[PDB]
Structure formats: C-alpha cells, structure tokens
Write an enzyme that holds these catalytic residues in place. Sequence first.
Site, PDB file in Angstrom:
ATOM      1  N   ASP A 152       0.866  -1.244   0.010  1.00 14.37           N
ATOM      2  CA  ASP A 152      -0.023   0.028   0.025  1.00 14.37           C
ATOM      3  C   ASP A 152       0.972   1.229   0.209  1.00 14.37           C
ATOM      4  OD1 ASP A 152      -2.114   1.868   0.452  1.00 14.37           O
ATOM      5  OD2 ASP A 152      -2.210   1.414   2.586  1.00 14.37           O
ATOM      6  N   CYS A 202     -10.247   8.439  -8.973  1.00  9.66           N
ATOM      7  CA  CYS A 202     -11.187   9.297  -8.553  1.00  9.66           C
ATOM      8  C   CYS A 202     -11.144  10.658  -8.780  1.00  9.66           C
ATOM      9  CB  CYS A 202     -11.694   8.968  -7.308  1.00  9.66           C
ATOM     10  SG  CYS A 202     -13.132   9.823  -6.711  1.00  9.66           S
ATOM     11  N   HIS A 232     -31.592 -16.194  16.847  1.00  4.76           N
ATOM     12  CA  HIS A 232     -33.061 -16.419  16.804  1.00  4.76           C
ATOM     13  C   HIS A 232     -33.592 -16.317  18.367  1.00  4.76           C
ATOM     14  CE1 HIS A 232     -31.784 -20.280  19.351  1.00  4.76           C
ATOM     15  NE2 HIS A 232     -30.813 -20.297  18.376  1.00  4.76           N
ATOM     16  N   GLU A 237     -27.642 -23.060  11.648  1.00  2.00           N
ATOM     17  CA  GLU A 237     -26.690 -23.360  12.424  1.00  2.00           C
ATOM     18  C   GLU A 237     -25.664 -24.406  11.899  1.00  2.00           C
ATOM     19  OE1 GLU A 237     -24.846 -22.276  14.584  1.00  2.00           O
ATOM     20  OE2 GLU A 237     -25.422 -22.522  16.713  1.00  2.00           O
TER      21      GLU A 237
HETATM   22  N1  LIG Z   1     -12.708   3.216  -4.998  1.00  2.00           N
HETATM   23  C1  LIG Z   1     -12.552   4.342  -4.197  1.00  2.00           C
HETATM   24  N2  LIG Z   1     -12.371   5.618  -4.673  1.00  2.00           N
HETATM   25  C2  LIG Z   1     -12.518   6.732  -3.755  1.00  2.00           C
HETATM   26  N3  LIG Z   1     -12.614   6.559  -2.476  1.00  2.00           N
HETATM   27  C3  LIG Z   1     -12.841   5.415  -1.989  1.00  2.00           C
HETATM   28  C4  LIG Z   1     -12.762   4.274  -2.884  1.00  2.00           C
HETATM   29  N4  LIG Z   1     -12.862   3.153  -2.025  1.00  2.00           N
HETATM   30  C5  LIG Z   1     -13.019   3.878  -0.585  1.00  2.00           C
HETATM   31  N5  LIG Z   1     -12.938   5.080  -0.684  1.00  2.00           N
HETATM   32  C6  LIG Z   1     -12.741   5.808   0.603  1.00  2.00           C
HETATM   33  O1  LIG Z   1     -11.490   6.312   0.684  1.00  2.00           O
HETATM   34  C7  LIG Z   1     -11.248   6.855   2.153  1.00  2.00           C
HETATM   35  C8  LIG Z   1     -10.197   6.588   2.967  1.00  2.00           C
HETATM   36  O2  LIG Z   1      -9.033   6.833   1.988  1.00  2.00           O
HETATM   37  P1  LIG Z   1      -7.662   5.984   2.158  1.00  2.00           P
HETATM   38  O3  LIG Z   1      -7.812   4.539   2.047  1.00  2.00           O
HETATM   39  O4  LIG Z   1      -6.998   6.553   3.483  1.00  2.00           O
HETATM   40  O5  LIG Z   1      -6.807   6.703   1.042  1.00  2.00           O
HETATM   41  P2  LIG Z   1      -5.391   6.583   0.418  1.00  2.00           P
HETATM   42  O6  LIG Z   1      -4.634   5.104   0.972  1.00  2.00           O
HETATM   43  O7  LIG Z   1      -5.478   6.472  -1.232  1.00  2.00           O
HETATM   44  O8  LIG Z   1      -4.748   7.883   0.748  1.00  2.00           O
HETATM   45  C9  LIG Z   1     -12.689   6.360   2.801  1.00  2.00           C
HETATM   46  O9  LIG Z   1     -13.347   7.428   3.174  1.00  2.00           O
HETATM   47  C10 LIG Z   1     -13.462   5.560   1.665  1.00  2.00           C
HETATM   48  O10 LIG Z   1     -14.934   6.099   1.603  1.00  2.00           O
HETATM   49  F1  ALF Z   2     -29.184 -21.071  20.293  1.00  5.41           F
HETATM   50 AL1  ALF Z   2     -28.934 -21.222  18.407  1.00  5.41          AL
HETATM   51  F2  ALF Z   2     -29.079 -21.576  16.854  1.00  5.41           F
HETATM   52  F3  ALF Z   2     -28.063 -19.565  18.290  1.00  5.41           F
HETATM   53  F4  ALF Z   2     -29.975 -22.857  18.819  1.00  5.41           F
END
Ligand SMILES: Nc1ncnc2c1ncn2[C@@H]1O[C@H](COP(=O)(O)OP(=O)(O)O)[C@@H](O)[C@H]1O
Ligand code: ALF
Lengths: 431, 431
Positions: free
Chosen positions: A116, A146, A245, A314
């Site tokens: 990243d 974007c 449930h 379940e």
């Molecule tokens: N495909 C996308 N395009 C634009 N914004 C997005 C996308 N997916 C998630 N987001 C928004 O990105 C925001 C977070 O940005 P971030 O992940 O920290 O960006 P970066 O790592 O690019 O700086 C969140 O608010 C989310 O709503």
């Molecule tokens: F108590 Al269960 F499925 F959550 F029987």
Amino acid sequence: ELTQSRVQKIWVPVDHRPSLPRSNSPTVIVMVGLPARGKTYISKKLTRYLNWIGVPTKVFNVGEYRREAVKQYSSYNFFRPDNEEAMKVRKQCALAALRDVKSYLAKEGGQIAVFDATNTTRERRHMILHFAKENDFKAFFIESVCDDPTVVASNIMEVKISSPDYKDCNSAEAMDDFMKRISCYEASYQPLDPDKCDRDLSLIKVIDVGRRFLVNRVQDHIQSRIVYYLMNIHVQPRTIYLCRHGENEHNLQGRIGGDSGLSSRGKKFASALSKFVEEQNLKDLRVWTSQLKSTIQTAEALRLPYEQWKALNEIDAGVCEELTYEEIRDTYPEEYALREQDKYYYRYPTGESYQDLVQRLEPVIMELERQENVLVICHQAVLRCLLAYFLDKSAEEMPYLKCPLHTVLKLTPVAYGCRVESIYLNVESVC
Amino acid sequence: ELTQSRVQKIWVPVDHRPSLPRSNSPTVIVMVGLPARGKTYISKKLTRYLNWIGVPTKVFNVGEYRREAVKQYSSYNFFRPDNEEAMKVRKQCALAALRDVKSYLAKEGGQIAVFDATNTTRERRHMILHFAKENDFKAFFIESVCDDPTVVASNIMEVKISSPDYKDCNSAEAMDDFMKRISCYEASYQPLDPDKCDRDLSLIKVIDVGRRFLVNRVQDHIQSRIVYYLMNIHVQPRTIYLCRHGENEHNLQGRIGGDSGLSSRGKKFASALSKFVEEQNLKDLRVWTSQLKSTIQTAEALRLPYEQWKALNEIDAGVCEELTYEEIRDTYPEEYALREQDKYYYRYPTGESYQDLVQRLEPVIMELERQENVLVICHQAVLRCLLAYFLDKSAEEMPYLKCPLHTVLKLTPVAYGCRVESIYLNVESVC
Ligand SMILES: Nc1ncnc2c1ncn2[C@@H]1O[C@H](COP(=O)(O)OP(=O)(O)O)[C@@H](O)[C@H]1O
Ligand code: ALF
Ligand SMILES: Nc1ncnc2c1ncn2[C@@H]1O[C@H](COP(=O)(O)OP(=O)(O)O)[C@@H](O)[C@H]1O
Ligand code: ALF
Ligand SMILES: [Cl-]
Ligand SMILES: [Cl-]
C-alpha cells in the site's frame, strides 16, 4: 488404507513412516493512485476478506513506515517532488516495506502481501515488478482513479484530518495541507495503461468509486476472487444488525442444534426485536433468516418481508445433534476434548467445523457487501463467523466471540472498518 | 404458527385462508459485435449457466428468426448495407424476436432474455433500449471485441462453415463468403463507448477472448453474477472426466449414503480408472474428489495429486442416511412417495434436495470453468447435477440422468456445447 484425522475428520493415506521420518506462487498486490483515493481502505477491507476466507494476507502501509521513521509530520512540504532528502526517506521506507514483504511471503507463510503506497510512476512500479520477479512473486495491481472533488473532500474529512499526522491541526488547515499534498503528485502521476504500456500487467482499475472497472490479465483464482470482491463492495454508509433466533426449546433443554421452535421468552424477544427495529426508523431494511424454524418465527414477529438462506443455518453437529453437553461429554469424551482444544478446525462426526461455516457463508458475505441496511436473524456459530468477518477476528478467536441470546449486534462503518454496538432487548433467556 | 412444507421442508406461516381464498424487473441482455465474435457461444453458455442455477433464461437468436423467414441462404449479398429489402427483413426479424422477448419476460415467467444479434449501431441499440424502457425491463449489454485474424478464422471453421446457411458450400467458399459478410458491418460498426456516449449503459466489453474487460454500471446481483461468470470462462479446448467412487460397501448392502469404503470390485475399478487415465496420455490432469472415503480411496489408486472438496460430497439423506430403500419405504412411506413425485425439489428431513446440491456445487462449476483437464471422482447425485450443467439438462430431468458405477463420462467441447462419451471400465458392480 486411509485413516480419518481426529480433529478435522479428513481421510488421509496411513503414513506408515519409515524409521527415519522425513519432512503455488505468493502474490504482491500493488496499490496505485493519488492520495485519498481509498487505497488504504481497499487494502484493509480486501485483507479482512482474504484472511476470513483462509488466505494469509497482510497490509504493508508505506505511510506507516514513514510515520515511524520520521516521528512528527508538519506539512505537505515533506511530499514536494523537489525535496531530495524526503524523497530518499520515502524510497527507503518503500524498500524497508518490500524487505518485510519478502520475509512475510518467503519465510512467514503469507500468501498475499498488500503493498500500500501511491506507486504513481512507471519507474516505481518497474522497481516493484523487478522485486516480485527476482523473488518469484506474482504481481497484481489495483489502481483507484477518482477525480470527483466531493469524494476526495469527504475522504479527507473522514480519514485524513483525524490522522496522527494532523494531531497538531484543526480541520480547515488539515484539509488545506492535504489538498496541497495531493497536488505534489499530479505532475508525475502516470495512470496504469492496459491498452498500451501496461498491456502485460495483471490489473484492475477501479474508477469513480466502483462505477466502472478496467480488468487486464487475471492470472489465477486468487486474482479472480479479488476482482470479484472489488467489483461488489460500495462505500455508502449502512447498518447491519445481527442477532440469534429468540430463545428456543432446545436452549431450555440444553440440547444443541435441531430445528426446535421459540419458547415463550423467545417469542417475547421476537416482539421486542420488532419494537427495536421500528425505533431504528430505517427507510428500507432487508431481513434475512436461516431455514430453521426459530429464526423464521422470530422474523414473522416483524411483519416485514424476509428471505431464508440455507447457508445461515446453524452449524451441523452431525452425530451430536440434539444431545445435551452432558450427554456429549459422557458418550463422546474424546470428541468433546478434541473440540475444546481446536475449536475452529474441529469437525463433528458427520457434521461441520467453523471452518466449513466460513465456506458456506462466503456468498452471504458477498451479498451483504451489495446490500444497504440488513438484519440477519441467525444462530450462535453463524453469528460468530459473520462477526469475525466484520470485526476482523482471527480463526482462533471466532468460536469464542460473545454472541448471547436476545441481543442485537449493530455494525456501522467508521473510518477503515466497522464499529459494533450491543443492544440487549431486555428479555431473559437460559444462559 | 408455522408448518413445514412436505416436499421442500420449508417453514411457512400457516395460511388459514379465509372462506374466499385470494391469489423484481426482468432483464434483456443485449449482445453486441461483429459476426464470428462469440456472441452466440456466449449467449448459449451463459443461458446454460443461468438456468442451472435457477434463473429462467432464454436465447433469442435473430439469425434463426432470419433463417426461418427467408428459407435458404445463398450469399453475403443478403447482408449488404445497400440491400433495402434484406435490411427490412433483418429489422422485422429483430422486432419479431423482441415480441417474443416481451412475451417470455412479461407473460411466461422468464427472468432473463438473451437478445442475440449484431446490434452494432447506436440506432439499433437505442431502439432496444426504448423497448426495454417501455416494458419496464432492465437492459445489460455484452459486447465481444476481437480483432485477432486467427481467432476469427478459427471461429468461422468451427461454427460457421457447418452452419445450415452453408449446406450448399465447401469450406473455402464458406470462409470467403463469411469474411465478406463480416466486412459489410465494418463501416457502420459503433463499438460501445462507456467513457462517453454509453456512460449510462450497464455493460461489459469482453476484449480479445477474455484477456481484458471493461465493466460499467452493474445494477444488481444478477448482472454482478453474469459479469463474474463471463470473466472466468475461456475458449481453449480441454476434457472433463466424471465418475462415481468405485463401488462401496453400502452399495453392496443397498444402504444409501454414509461414509463406507471401497469393496473389492470398487478397488478393481480404481485400478482400471488408473489404467484408463494413463491411456488418455494427458500433459497435465487435475484430480478432484469429495471428502467421503470412497472417492479418496479411488483417487489414491491413481498416484496423482488430488484435492478434496466438501462441496462434492454425496447428497445428505438426513434421517434416511444409511437406510436401505426397503427400510425407507417401510419407515417413511410418505417421504418415499413425496420424493418419487417431485425428485428435484424434494428434501430429505434434516437433509438435502438436488436443488440444495446445485447451490453447493456453484463454486465447483466456476472453478471447473477456470481449469483445463480435470477428473472429478464423486457421487451419484453430484454427478448428475454436474452432468445437467454440462449437457444443459433441466431440473426435472437432472435426478434421473444415467450415471452407473464404474463408468467414466468424458465431456469434450464441440461447437456451442459439450459432447459426452461413456467409457465403461469393465468391472462389475451391484445394480
Ligand atoms: N474506490 C474508491 N474511490 C474513492 N474513494 C474511496 C474508494 N474506496 C474507498 N474510498 C474512500 O477512501 C477513504 C479513505 O481513503 P484512504 O484509503 O486513506 O486513501 P489513500 O490510501 O488513497 O490515501 C474512505 O473514506 C472511503 O470512503
Ligand atoms: F441458540 Al442457536 F442457533 F443460536 F440454537
Ligand atoms: N469472447 C470471444 N471472442 C472471440 N471468439 C469467441 C469468444 N467466445 C467464444 N468465441 C468463439 O466463438 C465461436 C462461435 O462464434 P459465434 O458465437 O457463432 O459468433 P457470432 O454469434 O458472433 O457470429 C466459438 O468457436 C468460440 O470459440
Ligand atoms: F454412494 Al455413491 F455414487 F454410490 F456416492
Ligand atoms: Cl511527490
Ligand atoms: Cl450490414
């Protein structure tokens, strides 16, 4: 000659070991794009997904390497392309992240490393490609494009201003700094070009918050699964409610499983669930149940349309179905003890593990990503599995998550994940 | 008050009907592209898929309306854009197909209509869009773009020359005619343009036999599933072998299900399967089993790597597990008779239907699409379900498909589907 393994109940060839017993490719996912494009949000949510379905995945967030290397952030000046020292710090952080990627994939058992960073230049991507090639790692690129000013601003407000980089900042100045930071990258930004230069790269370009995708050269089933996932998630806020449930007659008797009906307290829960939902005052709310009677009786109290999923039933206790935990200890002491020591992987004879549950629940999770507001009325083991996905709990902790009767778990998006609120509906139940 | 339905075992609210008992959007998939781009191959294979997973789908092949309207084809001259009469015949055929689409979707219970024609002009697509809009039908476009001369030629040889349009033709002249036919469309061809003109259309563009995709505005879960499918199929030839486990001890006893081991004849089958496979002389062959012992013993005889899928396990007979058909008739006459009259939808108490099998097998089918050569060692009900998908057999016929012990079914691509060859491996078994 096959024997069945004790915990997972898998048939394996008897390994009549001789007297001296002797004892594919990992993938680097490369994030690409300008700051505040969702790269980190994607990296974490994808990783959450891949780990839950059993693919060991880890995020390598270069910005966190930089935060740790440089100690306090003051301004976008650090990101200027004319900043020679910061460029070399940034580069060193990337190489240190790559070192850790190598170790995670080649030595620690990781399958997917999510790299990243911005990675906005062809030269930086050539560098990562060289590294994957020399390590025999596959490389898959995810670019988020974007250009919408509203989305970028909203991204800054939601995740950036509250960042520890801006601890000594107010909102207006945080926002202004971050906008100038973004402009630093714009002159050198080289978007992926699958139709020419990047012809041979395995990639997905996610455009305008998932409205449009470009996909080139998916190489294998993990990339295929990644793409499918990325194409079915959305960013708009919503709520997921999860509950068991209402109490049932087997709960009263301490017998596990079966298909028993609601007790009178289970029915008091069902009316209260009905009042809880009405108080949430949601425009549209989807209701999902399993195919077991106790969930469906519970949903009937709501007087909303609902949909039954067999995948929500379940866990199947196989030969232990309908037994009390006391009769299990007595008739199957060995099975009882295997389960207690390895509760996730343990399979009941002719029944299921939590691991089996996860696989059955994969399409439930994919459809939940597509939905807006949803209430899921289900079962203890199911609910735990779902909660682990939403709260990023590991396999080992999943079968112990706290999921009492008559309690709604309310999950709401905050930043890069989900927040859980517990709402007990004030109706007694066995323990 | 809920009652369990008798056949499917679904809990439903008791419908204490009053004395006067009283009794979303369909989709048009629009194929787009030049002749011999795979439009018809896609239309049929997608429809095969959608029907098998329970979505009622039908292909409306305009070319077949034209064949029926015009009686005998002589030359590409029919497709000239200056051919006024043929243009109006072509248009009338399209409108007659659309009439049938309307009827299928709005009156016959169809969900997905696959409108298979060239649809290469914006004006023709505007016309189809108007028709979907006025009928409240959704519209999803699939364009196949392929400029590779080798693929087009190979498409002509494989499906065109043997077409009934060319019955009075040899190969060389068939090929030459079809190439001129294609050139008729080239001047007016307007590819989908998601980045401008077609911004608002829901579409996938499939480029260079699935190497690259463009995807715009998936609107719902059926389009989402369609896209996923289209992105995971490939055209290269391969073989799929399907067989049951070698005979097992429950076969000998006429007891259904369980997890019994191979009899001595089942083990003779397993050695013969081993010799059959070796005689196929395949470069690479994947072997898949269920998690039940009898399939795994069978695969062990092969001395090839194999992979176990829980999704390949035999239908779960629930309370009838391990019973003979005689004990079923005697203990559960009512269950026996419900099953005989509605064998696909019928669920065993606490067990499964063929319908449940289909849902469990969906990921097996998706992964099979990704593979090359594969041998699947499985179970009677499983094998039937898989065969129905490959041979496009309906739900009602699926549970009766002939799938004897000790017999390999070999499936190979021919034209727009799969051919099955039976190979009995000459080892006796119960009947
Ligand atoms: N495909 C996308 N395009 C634009 N914004 C997005 C996308 N997916 C998630 N987001 C928004 O990105 C925001 C977070 O940005 P971030 O992940 O920290 O960006 P970066 O790592 O690019 O700086 C969140 O608010 C989310 O709503
Ligand atoms: F108590 Al269960 F499925 F959550 F029987
Ligand atoms: N995405 C694709 N691009 C090009 N050819 C394809 C594609 N998918 C399938 N084919 C090939 O198309 C051939 C059949 O063409 P057909 O479906 O009759 O074309 P059309 O309906 O466009 O005239 C098959 O040989 C198959 O191999
Ligand atoms: F028990 Al079988 F095919 F005979 F699964
Ligand atoms: Cl920069
Ligand atoms: Cl034409």
